[PDB]
Design a protein around this ligand. Structure first.
Ligand SMILES: *[C@@H]1O[C@H](CO)[C@@H](O[C@@H]2O[C@H](CO)[C@@H](O[C@@H]3O[C@H](CO[C@H]4O[C@H](CO)[C@@H](O)[C@H](O)[C@@H]4O)[C@@H](O)[C@H](O[C@H]4O[C@H](CO)[C@@H](O)[C@H](O)[C@@H]4O)[C@@H]3O)[C@H](O)[C@H]2NC(C)=O)[C@H](O[C@H]2O[C@@H](C)[C@@H](O)[C@@H](O)[C@@H]2O)[C@H]1NC(C)=O
Ligand SMILES: *[C@@H]1O[C@H](CO)[C@@H](O[C@@H]2O[C@H](CO)[C@@H](O[C@@H]3O[C@H](CO[C@H]4O[C@H](CO)[C@@H](O)[C@H](O)[C@@H]4O)[C@@H](O)[C@H](O[C@H]4O[C@H](CO)[C@@H](O)[C@H](O)[C@@H]4O)[C@@H]3O)[C@H](O)[C@H]2NC(C)=O)[C@H](O[C@H]2O[C@@H](C)[C@@H](O)[C@@H](O)[C@@H]2O)[C@H]1NC(C)=O
Ligand SMILES: *[C@@H]1O[C@H](CO)[C@@H](O[C@@H]2O[C@H](CO)[C@@H](O[C@@H]3O[C@H](CO[C@H]4O[C@H](CO)[C@@H](O)[C@H](O)[C@@H]4O)[C@@H](O)[C@H](O[C@H]4O[C@H](CO)[C@@H](O)[C@H](O)[C@@H]4O)[C@@H]3O)[C@H](O)[C@H]2NC(C)=O)[C@H](O[C@H]2O[C@@H](C)[C@@H](O)[C@@H](O)[C@@H]2O)[C@H]1NC(C)=O
Ligand SMILES: *[C@@H]1O[C@H](CO)[C@@H](O)[C@H](O)[C@H]1NC(C)=O
Ligand SMILES: *[C@@H]1O[C@H](CO)[C@@H](O)[C@H](O)[C@H]1NC(C)=O
Ligand SMILES: *[C@@H]1O[C@H](CO)[C@@H](O)[C@H](O)[C@H]1NC(C)=O
Ligand SMILES: *[C@@H]1O[C@H](CO)[C@@H](O)[C@H](O)[C@H]1NC(C)=O
Ligand SMILES: *[C@@H]1O[C@H](CO)[C@@H](O)[C@H](O)[C@H]1NC(C)=O
Ligand SMILES: *[C@@H]1O[C@H](CO)[C@@H](O)[C@H](O)[C@H]1NC(C)=O
Ligand SMILES: *[C@@H]1O[C@H](CO)[C@@H](O)[C@H](O)[C@H]1NC(C)=O
Ligand SMILES: *[C@@H]1O[C@H](CO)[C@@H](O)[C@H](O)[C@H]1NC(C)=O
Ligand SMILES: *[C@@H]1O[C@H](CO)[C@@H](O)[C@H](O)[C@H]1NC(C)=O
Ligand SMILES: *[C@@H]1O[C@H](CO)[C@@H](O)[C@H](O)[C@H]1NC(C)=O
Ligand SMILES: *[C@@H]1O[C@H](CO)[C@@H](O)[C@H](O)[C@H]1NC(C)=O
Ligand SMILES: *[C@@H]1O[C@H](CO)[C@@H](O)[C@H](O)[C@H]1NC(C)=O
Lengths: 326, 171, 326, 171, 171, 326
C-alpha cells in the first residue's frame, strides 16, 4: 500500500527562457507578443481613412487641378499618402511651414470646403487669367489651384490697391492659403502687375504678414523659372482677416472649416491597400487583431494597440518544468 | 531546482495526472490511480493568474511615436525626436525581456516549492506509520483503504488509529 | 511541558498587493507615496514668489502703465501668473520670440530696473507725445509702456536720423526691449514720421537687427488698427548696443539688470493664494510637506520634491502576513 | 506560502507576542509565556530596513517637467516635449509599481523562510528528546524548566543531559 | 540565510576545498579529504554564467547623447535635449543599480539553497545508518571505506548493505 | 567515520551589496562597470580624427586665411575642436544657421574641395580687391576667406547685374557658402558698390534666397564696424544653383563635395592630445579599452562603447558568501 506525491507532465514541447536557464520546456505558457499583421488598411471606429491616391498632402489642400477627386468635404479616421504620388505643388515654389502644416492637418478628422473670398472681392483687377501649363487639369492644359486665384492686371491698366476681408463668425477654425508670385525678370513683373513697388500684406487680431516680390531667374521646374511662395494660416473663431495688396497676390479663394480630433491623429505613408474592413488597431504596416500585451510590428499606429518592442518573443511560463516519463 | 523537488528527489512528472499541477498517486487493494491536490493546484492557478494579469496591467501604457516631419534645417530636433523614440523603445524592450526572464525563473521555483511543501504535508501526518522511499513515495506499515488514502490527501489522516498496527508491522 | 515556534500577529487591517496576491493584510507596512497638498504658495528657501496679479509676463517687463505695482526691482524664488490677468500688451502687436523670452525670465531670480536710454539721447525729435488710449494708466486715459518711448516728429519738421549707444560696463546681462510701429495707412505714417523710406536698425558685437514699417489696415484691437512689433534681447557684459533709426522707432528707455538663477526656475500659472509660510517643496497645485519618496500631486514643481508618479498608492510590506487567532 | 510555515503548518500568528516578528511560546511548571527570538527578529529588521532604504535611495532622482510654452507654429516640438515627459512618467510609474509588487511578494517569503528556519533550529537541538506535533510545537519527554527553555531559545540546549530521562519516558 | 545553510547550521566555509563551490569532507581509516560535488557545482556555474550573460545581453544597447549646439534663442529645445538625455541616464542608472542589488540577493540565496539541497540529498540516502550532528556532518554507525564514501557522493549509497551492522552498533 | 556537507571559502575580501545587506564579502564576483580611460584621442576603425587646432569649425570650412593648414580635402573618423581656437570668422558677422551647419558637418566623414565659381564667372566687376586687415593671412596683413570672393566695383564704373550658375552633375551633395556685405554708412556703400538699391538673390530647384544690404554703424569688432551675413546651403545631386546680384555679394568661390557617414558622427571639444594609436571606443574625455558592460566616463563618444551610467561600481556576485574558518 503506497501513496506518492508528484507533479503534472504533458506532451508540451513549448519552451521558455529564464535568467538561469535557456530552452526550458514547460507544461503551460502564454505568449505576450504579437508578430502577426493584416497587410492592409481598415476602418477605425467604423470611420474610413482618407486615400490621397496620386495626390500628396500639398496637392490635396491646395486644390491641385488633378486632385478634383479629393476636392471638397472630407472625413477621416486617418490619412494614407502614397509614396509615388505625383500631384503636389504644380507651379514651382515653397509651401512655408510645410512640416507644421502637415502636423496640423494630421490633428484633424474633418474639413469642410467653402468659398472664403469670391472673385468679386477684388475690385479693379482681373481674376480670369490665372492659369499655367505648369498646373494642367485633366481635361485642359493650363489651369490653377482650385483654392487660389492668380490675379493679374486687366488687359490695359495699372494694378491698383485691392482689399478683401472675412469675419469668422462660426465656431470652427478656418484653414486657408495664399501666395506671393516672384517673376523671373522685371519684364514679366511689369507685364503682369505693372510697375512700382509691390506688396502683399495680410493681418488678423493675432497675425501679421508682409511680403514683397523677389525677382530672379531660378532653375526651370515644370517649365517655370519663376516661383510662388505659398503660405497657410488658421483663422480662429471670432477673428477677422484683412487682405491688402497692390500686386503679385495669389489670393485665397476657397478655404476649410477645420474639425480638430479628440483622439490621436495619424498620416500613414504606405502602398498598402485600403479594404472594406474594421479594426481597433491600425499599424502603418498593417492591421493587428490580438489581445496580446506586446507587439513587434511597428511603433507607428492609431487606435488601441499593444506596446511596441524589439523582441521576437515574450513568453511567460505559467505551468511548471515539463519532465515526462519515461 | 531551488527547492529540490521538481526534477529533484522526485525525478519526473506524471503524464497520467491530467487534472492538476500537483497531486498524488496511490496504491492499495482497490488498485491504483492519480489524483490532483485541488487546494494547492487552485492556489497556484490563482497566484500565477494574478501575476500574469498584474504584468499585463503594468504594461498597459504605450509610448507613441509620431509621423511628424522635419526639414533640412531641422536636423537637430529631427535627431532629437529619433533618439527619444529609440530611447523609450530600448527601455521598454529591456523592461519586458528582463521581467519575463526573471518571472519565469521565479514561477518555476514557485511550482518547485509547492511540490516540496505538499510532500512535507504528507510526511508530517504519516510519521513512522509509513516508510519514506526518498522518491516522493510512502509505503504504509498498515492497510490504507480508499478513505484512509483520501484522509491523507485532505489532511485528516488519523495517526493514532493506525499506530499499533504500524508499530507491530514495522518492528 | 511544551515549546512552540511562531510569528507576530496584531490588529492591523492595512493591506498590500503582491505579484501573486492582492489585498494581503500585513502586520507592518510603509506608504511611499504622498497624495496630500497644502493648496497655496509659500516661500522657497525663505524667498517669496513674485505675484504678477492682474498683469501678465508681457505687461510686467514691458512696463504696462497699469502694472506700476510691479514696476522696478524684483526678487523671486518663482513666478506666479494669474490665469485671467488683464494687463498684457495694451497697444496691439506681437512680442517676438515670446516663448523664449518667458523661458529666459523664468531662469532668473532678480531684475534691477535702470534707465538705459534717457530721452535726451534722441536729439532732433519729440519724446513728449508717445501716448495712446489703447494703453491707459490708472489715473489717466492715454499713456504708454514705462520702459519704452514712442517717438514722433517735432510739431513741424522732418524726421532725422537719430542715434543712441549704451556700453554695458557692469558684470550682469541686460534685458531690454524696443519696437517698430506699423501705421494702418500712409497718412498716419506721414503724419507721425513724415515721408520717405524709414528704418530701425540696431546692433551689437553679437546681434544685428533691421526692420522697416509695414503699412496696412488690420482688424481693430483695443481701438487700434495699427500695430507695434515688440522685440527683446540681452546685452551681455562688455557688449555695446548701437541704435539707429530715421523713424517708426519705439525706443528702449528703461531696461533690467538680470540675475540668472543657480537653481531650477519656475513660472506657475495658478489662482492659488500666496500666504505667509515656508516650504521646501512647492507644486503648481500646492505645497508638499512630506518625507515620502513618491508623490502623485503634480510633475510641475520647484525645490526638493518627491518623484511624481500616476500611482494612487505605493505601499511596501515591512512586516509579515497578519494571521491573528482565533 | 513558499516555505510553508506562515499560514502553513503553523496556521496562525500570535497576538500575544508583541515584542518581535518571530519567537516562542513555552509551557512548563512555572506557567506559560511568549518570547521573541531576538537574533532572528533583529536580523530581519536590519534586512527589511536596508531594503526600504535601498529602494528609497534608488528612487532619489526626479524627472522635471517644465512650464515652457510653444507657439502655434511649434506644434511639433511642443508635442515632442509632451510625449517625452509622459514617456518618463510612464517608465517611472511602471518602475515603482512593479518593484513594490515584486518586493512585497519577496518580503513576505523572507518572513516565511525565517519562521521555517527558526522551527528547524529548534527541531535540530531537541531531536528525539521531544515530540513534534506538526503545528510548530514540541512536547518534551522530560521536565524542561525555565533555564532549559532558555537554552533552547538561545541554541545551547543540552541533548545528552536529558537523553535517558527522555529515553525512559518515550519508550 | 533564507535556506538556513550557508552561515547557518553549517557555520562556515572550507578554504580546504578549492575545486568547487559545494562538496564534501570525509573521514575514515584511509584518512580525511575534501571533494567538490561536481554535478551541483557545474549546474550552479552554468546557471550563474547564464545569468551574467543574460544581464550583459539585455544591457547591450546604448542611449547616445549628442554634441549638438543651441543658440540663445533655442533655450527651450536646448533644455528639452538636456532633460531627455539626463532622463534616460537616470532610468538606466536605476535599472543597472537596482538589478545588481536584486540579483546579488538572489544569487546568494541560490547558493544557500544548493548547499541545503546537497545536505538533504545525503541525509536521504544515509537514513538511520548514520548520526546527524546538526552541523552538516554525519557519523556512520558502520565502517565506510573510500568506495562507500564515493557512493554517497554520487548518490548510489547502498542502505540495505550496511543496515544490520548499523542496526547493531546504533542500539 | 564521517562525511560532511559544506561550501567553498577563500581569501577574497571583495564585497558586494544586496537589497537586504551591504558589504557582503563573496568568494567570486565580476565588476561590470569601467571607470578607467586613456586620456587621449586615437583612431577609430584605423581612421584618424581631424584636428582643427587653432581654427574653429567656422574658420575651417569658410577658409580663414590662417587655416591654410586644414585647407583642401579632409577625411575623418571624428572631429576635434580646441576650446581656445582663435581662427574663426575674422571679418565680423553672423554665420546663419550655425548650429544646423555644425550638425551637418558632423554627419560627414569626408569633404573634397573644388572650385565651384571661378572669378571669371563675374563679368563686369572686380574680383582683385576683396581683402581686409580684419582677415590677415600669416604672411600678409590683409586677406580673405579662401572659399569666398569679396566683390567690389572696377576702379571707375557702376556695379552691374552679375550672374553665375553651377550644375551639380556629380553623385555627391555640395556644401557651399556665400555672403551679403552690410557697410556701416552710405558712403562705404556708394564707394564699393555704387548707388541704387542692391540685392543678392540665389535659387535652386528647392531653395530661394533674397537679401538686401542693411546699412548701420555697429560696434567695432576686429577693427570693423561693418558686417557680413554669411550663409550656407547644400546643393543636392542633379540640382543647379543660380547666382544673381547687382552688389554687396560675397560670392561662392570654392565649395566641398560632401560624403555623409554611415556611422554616428562626432565633434569633440577638447584639449586632449591625438596620438598614434587605435581604439574601438573613443570618449570625449578619453579612450576605453574594456569588455565591461557599463561605463561611467562619459555619455559622449563614438565607436562601440559600454553603456554610460552614474554608478561608481556595478559588481555582480557570482560566487557565494565568503565565510572562511577559523
Ligand atoms: C477527508 O476525507 C475523509 C475520508 O473520505 C472524510 O471522512 C469521511 O467522511 C464521510 C462523510 O462525511 C464519512 O462517511 C460517514 O461516516 C459516518 C461514520 O460512521 C463510520 O465511522 C467510522 C469511519 O472510519 C467507522 O469506523 C464506523 O464503524 C462507521 O462505519 C457514518 O455514520 C455515515 O453514514 C451515515 O451518515 C451519512 C451522512 O454522512 C448518511 O447520509 C448515511 O445515509 C448514513 O446514515 C457515513 O458513512 C466517513 O466515515 C469519513 N471517514 C473517516 C475515516 O472518518 C472527510 O470528510 C469528513 O471529515 C471531517 C473531519 C470534516 O472535515 C468534514 O469535512 C467531513 O464530514 C474528508 N474531509 C474533508 C474536509 O474533505
Ligand atoms: C543560554 O541560556 C542558558 C539558560 O539560561 C544560559 O545558561 C545559564 O547561564 C547562567 C549564567 O551564566 C548560569 O548561572 C550560573 O550557573 C553556574 C553553574 O552552576 C550550576 O550549573 C548547573 C546548571 O545546570 C547545575 O547543574 C549546577 O548544580 C549548578 O547549580 C553557577 O555557579 C552560577 O552561580 C554563581 O556564579 C555567578 C556568575 O555567573 C555569580 O554571580 C553568583 O553569585 C554565583 O556565585 C550561576 O548560577 C546557568 O547555570 C546556566 N544554565 C545552564 C543550564 O548551563 C546561557 O548562558 C551561558 O551559556 C554559555 C554556554 C555561554 O554561551 C554564556 O553566554 C553564558 O554564561 C545562555 N547563553 C547565551 C549565549 O545567552
Ligand atoms: C559511484 O561510486 C561507486 C563507488 O566507487 C561506484 O561503484 C564502483 O564502481 C567500480 C567500477 O565500476 C566497481 O569496481 C568493479 O567492481 C566489480 C564488482 O566486484 C566487486 O563487487 C562488490 C563491490 O562492493 C564486492 O563486494 C565484490 O566482492 C567484488 O569485489 C569488479 O568485478 C570489478 O573488477 C573487474 O572489472 C573491471 C571493470 O569494471 C575490470 O577492468 C577489472 O580488471 C576487473 O576484472 C571492479 O573492481 C566497484 O565495485 C563499485 N563499487 C560498488 C560498491 O559497487 C559507481 O560506479 C558504478 O556504479 C554503477 C551503479 C553505475 O552508476 C556505473 O556508473 C558504475 O559502474 C559510481 N557511480 C557513478 C555513476 O559514478
Ligand atoms: C499532444 O497531444 C494532443 C492529443 O490530443 C495533440 O494536440 C498533439 O498530439 C500534442 N500536442 C502538442 C502541442 O504537442
Ligand atoms: C534552443 O534555443 C534556440 C532558440 O530557439 C534554438 O536553437 C532551438 O530551437 C531551441 N530548442 C532546442 C531544443 O534546442
Ligand atoms: C544640368 O545638366 C543636365 C545634364 O544632362 C541637364 O539634363 C540639366 O537640364 C541641367 N540643368 C539645368 C538647370 O540646366
Ligand atoms: C486572449 O485570447 C485568447 C484566444 O481567444 C484566449 O485564450 C486568452 O484567454 C485571452 N487572454 C485574455 C487575458 O483574455
Ligand atoms: C489596534 O489597537 C490599538 C489599541 O491601542 C488602537 O490603535 C486600535 O484599536 C487598533 N488600531 C488599528 C489601526 O486597527
Ligand atoms: C480589496 O481591494 C480593493 C482595493 O482597495 C477594495 O475593493 C477593497 O477595499 C480591498 N479590501 C477588501 C477587504 O476587500
Ligand atoms: C465680426 O462680426 C461680429 C458680429 O457680431 C462683430 O461683433 C465684430 O465686430 C466683427 N469683427 C470685425 C473686425 O468687424
Ligand atoms: C518619515 O516621517 C515619519 C513621520 O515623521 C517617520 O515615522 C518615518 O520614520 C520617516 N521616514 C524616514 C525614512 O525617516
Ligand atoms: C589570496 O592568496 C593568493 C595566493 O596565491 C594571493 O593572490 C593573495 O595572497 C590573496 N589574494 C587576495 C586578492 O586577497
Ligand atoms: C563598507 O562599505 C563602505 C563602502 O565601501 C566602506 O565604508 C567600507 O570600505 C566597506 N567595507 C568595510 C569592511 O567596512
Ligand atoms: C566700452 O567701455 C570699455 C571701457 O574700458 C571700452 O574699453 C570699450 O572700448 C567700450 N566699447 C565700445 C564699443 O566703445
Ligand atoms: C572580459 O575580460 C576579462 C579579462 O580579459 C576576462 O577575464 C573576462 O572573461 C572577459 N569577459 C567576457 C564576458 O568575455
Amino acid at each position: 500500500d503506497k501513496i506518492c506525491i508528484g507533479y503534472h507532465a504533458n506532451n508540451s514541447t513549448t519552451q521558455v527562457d529564464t535568467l538561469l536557464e535557456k530552452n526550458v520546456t514547460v507544461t503551460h505558457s502564454v505568449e505576450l507578443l504579437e508578430n502577426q499583421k493584416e497587410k492592409r488598411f481598415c476602418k477605425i471606429m467604423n470611420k474610413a481613412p482618407l486615400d490621397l491616391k496620386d495626390c500628396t498632402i500639398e496637392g490635396w489642400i491646395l486644390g491641385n487641378p488633378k486632385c478634383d477627386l479629393l476636392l471638397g468635404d472630407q472625413s477621416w479616421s486617418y490619412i494614407v499618402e502614397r509614396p509615388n504620388a505625383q500631384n503636389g505643388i504644380c507651379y514651382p515654389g515653397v509651401l512655408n511651414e510645410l512640416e507644421e502644416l502637415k502636423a496640423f492637418i494630421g490633428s484633424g478628422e474633418r474639413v469642410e470646403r467653402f468659398e472664403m473670398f469670391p472673385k468679386s472681392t477684388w475690385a479693379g483687377v482681373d481674376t480670369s487669367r490665372g492659369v499655367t501649363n505648369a498646373c494642367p487639369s485633366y481635361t485642359i492644359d493650363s489651369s490653377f489651384y482650385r483654392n487660389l486665384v492668380w490675379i493679374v492686371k486687366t488687359d490695359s491698366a495699372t494694378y491698383p490697391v485691392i482689399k478683401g476681408t472675412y469675419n469668422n463668425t462660426g465656431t470652427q477654425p478656418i484653414l486657408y492659403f495664399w501666395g506671393v508670385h516672384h517673376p523671373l525678370d522685371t519684364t514679366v513683373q511689369d507685364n503682369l502687375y505693372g510697375s512700382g513697388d509691390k506688396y502683399v500684406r495680410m493681418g488678423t487680431e493675432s497675425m501679421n504678414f508682409a511680403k514683397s516680390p523677389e525677382i530672379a531667374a531660378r532653375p526651370a521646374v515644370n517649365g517655370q523659372r519663376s516661383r510662388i511662395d505659398y503660405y497657410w494660416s488658421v483663422l480662429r473663431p471670432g477673428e477677422t482677416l484683412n487682405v491688402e495688396s497692390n500686386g503679385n497676390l495669389i489670393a485665397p479663394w476657397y478655404a476649410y472649416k477645420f474639425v480638430s480630433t479628440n483622439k490621436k491623429g495619424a498620416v500613414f505613408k504606405s502602398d498598402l491597400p485600403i479594404e472594406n474592413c474594421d479594426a481597433t488597431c491600425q499599424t502603418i504596416t498593417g492591421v493587428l487583431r490580438t489581445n496580446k500585451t506586446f507587439q513587434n510590428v511597428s511603433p507607428l499606429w492609431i487606435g488601441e494597440c499593444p506596446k511596441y518592442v524589439k523582441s521576437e518573443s515574450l513568453r511567460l511560463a505559467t505551468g511548471l518544468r515539463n519532465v515526462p516519463q519515461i | 531546482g531551488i527547492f529540490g523537488a521538481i526534477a529533484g528527489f522526485i525525478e519526473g512528472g506524471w503524464t497520467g495526472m491530467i487534472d492538476g499541477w500537483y497531486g498524488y498517486h496511490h496504491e492499495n487493494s482497490q488498485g491504483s490511480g492519480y489524483a490532483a491536490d485541488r487546494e494547492s493546484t487552485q492556489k497556484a492557478i490563482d497566484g500565477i493568474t494574478n501575476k500574469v494579469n498584474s504584468i499585463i496591467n503594468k504594461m498597459n501604457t504605450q509610448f507613441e511615436a509620431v509621423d511628424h516631419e522635419f526639414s533640412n534645417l531641422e536636423r537637430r530636433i529631427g535627431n532629437l525626436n529619433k533618439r527619444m523614440e529609440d530611447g523609450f523603445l530600448d527601455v521598454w524592450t529591456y523592461n519586458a525581456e528582463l521581467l519575463v526572464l526573471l518571472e519565469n525563473e521565479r514561477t518555476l521555483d514557485l511550482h518547485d516549492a509547492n511540490v516540496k511543501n505538499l510532500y512535507e504535508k504528507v510526511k508530517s501526518q504519516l510519521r513512522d506509520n509509513a516508510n519514506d522511499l526518498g522518491n516522493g513515495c510512502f509505503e504504509f506499515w498498515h492497510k490504507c483503504d480508499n478513505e484512509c488514502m483520501e484522509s491523507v490527501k485532505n489532511g485528516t489522516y488519523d495517526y493514532p488509529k493506525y499506530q499499533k498496527e504500524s508499530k507491530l508491522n514495522r518492528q
